[PDB]
Every structure is written in structure tokens, then in C-alpha cells.
Amino acid sequence: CPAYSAYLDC
Amino acid sequence: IIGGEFTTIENQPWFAAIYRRHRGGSVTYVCGGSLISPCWVISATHCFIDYPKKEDYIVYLGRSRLNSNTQGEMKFEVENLILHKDYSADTLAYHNDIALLKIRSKEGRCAQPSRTIQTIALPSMYNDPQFGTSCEITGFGKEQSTDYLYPEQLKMTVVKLISHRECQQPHYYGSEVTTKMLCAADPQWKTDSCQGDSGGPLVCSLQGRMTLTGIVSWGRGCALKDKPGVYTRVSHFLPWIRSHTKE
Ligand SMILES: N=C(N)Nc1ccccc1
């Protein structure tokens, strides 16, 4: 996961 | 969504709520999306890249609540799940973070406009509004960066488009924001997209019309000074979109 992801699963 | 206000589907009737069914039979929310035509919902590739199998996903339209049913909602299966072939995920950011879902009901129907369901227009290619233009974002994302639960009622807020000039400043995101992305934030930095809002719409008025200008992708923190939301610049993907959709 990218450090700035907004994806709930990260 | 940080700040902003609770709303209902009628104020954002293009909003698509996407869930993944679990081998248990548990079903949990994945991401938002936007209904761009009766059979087609657009979202972000990163929501699906881990589990890329259309069968596991359900799409709701007309849905105002996260974990309970809204009247007027309609449930859909994914007929095909189209990820972007140049998708990539970096240490900080996503690239080409866009996806298409073709929806069909078990009955075989596509979306039907209603009080609670309407399509949203795509912009013209490379046509985006001007920086400082106010736009709307919607979603079931966290109301605070530190929360562990998601809100049960849909939310929206208003943010302002930022120049690439300004978004590239090193105290913002520097080289990590490319021209295929769009920045938007509150001038006072009190409202934002957040975790769980990804795939959802950034909607602006572009020459009279409410248009889908962005797709929630990534940002550092939520409502953090100098660190705005980053969105997939939709105007730059029409060929991709039309290729896969004109079918
Ligand atoms: N919008 C932000 N400031 N941050 C953010 C956080 C999570 C997903 C997308 C964007």
C-alpha cells in the first residue's frame, strides 16, 4: 500500500 | 469525508457504493464510484487490484447508508471489471488510478434513473475547470483520520481545485503530482476526502453542467495543512473510457 493511499483496506 | 455534512443519495444520485463478498459470506465496503452511464460505473483501480475478480463484488446505487438498506436502492453484479493496464502504485501515490465496472442486475438490467439514481456527465477531453473552482466530493470515508469506524450515513463536502503550479511545491507534494492528477482542498484546510472515500467522485460545474472531474486517489493525512487531496484527472482518460465503454 502506498503511504498516502486513501483505500480502506490499507 | 472530513468536515462537510451528512447528505442523502438524492443529492449525489450518481454515487455508487461498492462492496466485496467474503468467502465467509461476510460482505464489506470496498470503495466508492460514479455512474457515468446506465451500465457503467467508474472508480479507482487500487480498490480491486488485490482481489481482481468480478464475481466477488456487488454494486449498489440509490444507497444512502453504509451497512443498512435505503429505499429506492438497487443492487448490481459486475459483468466486467476493467482495470487500467498502466496502473502503478508508488511509495506515496497511485498512477493511472482508474477502473470501470459494467453492472447488471441478476434480472439482466442496467441502472434506471430515479429520485435516487442518475448518471453523471464526463468532461470533454482535457477540458477541466479553472483553479479556485469549488467542487463536491462524496463518500462513506472516515470523518477523522484517526477514527477506526466509518460513518453509516453518506457525506459530502466542498473543496477547491488547486493549480499544478501550487500542488507541486515541495512543501505540498513536489514531483509526486503529475499532470494526470488533480489537487483539491479547502483554503482553510478544514475539510477533505479521507480513508474509505477512494474511487468516489469529485464533481464540478463545467460550462453549465455538473461534471465528473476527478476520482478520489490519494493524499497525505486528511485535512492536513498544505497537504491536499489528489484525484485522478478524468478529462485525461476519455479514450481509455470510450474504448472500453462503447461496447
Ligand atoms: N485527502 C487527503 N488529504 N488525504 C487522503 C487520505 C486518504 C485517501 C485520499 C486522500
CA dihedral B131, B132, B133, B135 (to 10 degrees): 100
Structure determined via: X-ray
* Atom 1 (ligand 1) nearest CA: B229
User: What b-and-e string marks burial along B73-101, b requiring 16 or more CB atoms within 10 Å of the CB?
Assistant: bbebbbeebbbbeebebeebbbbbbbbbb
Report the 3 state secondary structure along B140-156. Answer: CCCCCCCCCCCCCECEE
Angle at B157 between CA B154 and CA B158, to 5 degrees: 155
* Beta-carbon contacts of residue B57 (< 8 Å; ≥ 6 apart): B18, B19, B20, B21, B30, B48, B77, B78, B81, B101
DSSP string, B104-124: E-TTS-----BTTB---BPPP
What whole-number distance in Å separates Cα of residue B41 and Cα of residue B61?
Answer: 10
How many beta-carbon pairs under 8 angstroms link A with B? 51
Q: Do B160 and B212 meet the contact criterion of CB atoms below 8 Å apart?
A: no
* Beta-carbon contacts of residue B31 (< 8 Å; ≥ 6 apart): A7, A8, B18, B43, B44, B47, B48, B198, B199, B200
Answer yes or no: B97 catalytic: yes
* DSSP classification of residue B209: E
User: How do B99-104 and B40-43 pair as beta strands?
Assistant: antiparallel
Q: How many CB atoms lie within 10 A of CB B217?
A: 31
B→A contacts (Cβ < 8 Å), by residue, are: 29-31, 44, 46-47, 50, 89-94, 141, 150, 193-198, 216-220, 230
Answer yes or no: B197 catalytic: no
* DSSP classification of residue A5: B
CA B69 vs. chain centroid, Å, equals 21
Domains of chain B: 1-12+120-235 (2.40.10.10), 13-119+236-247 (2.40.10.10)
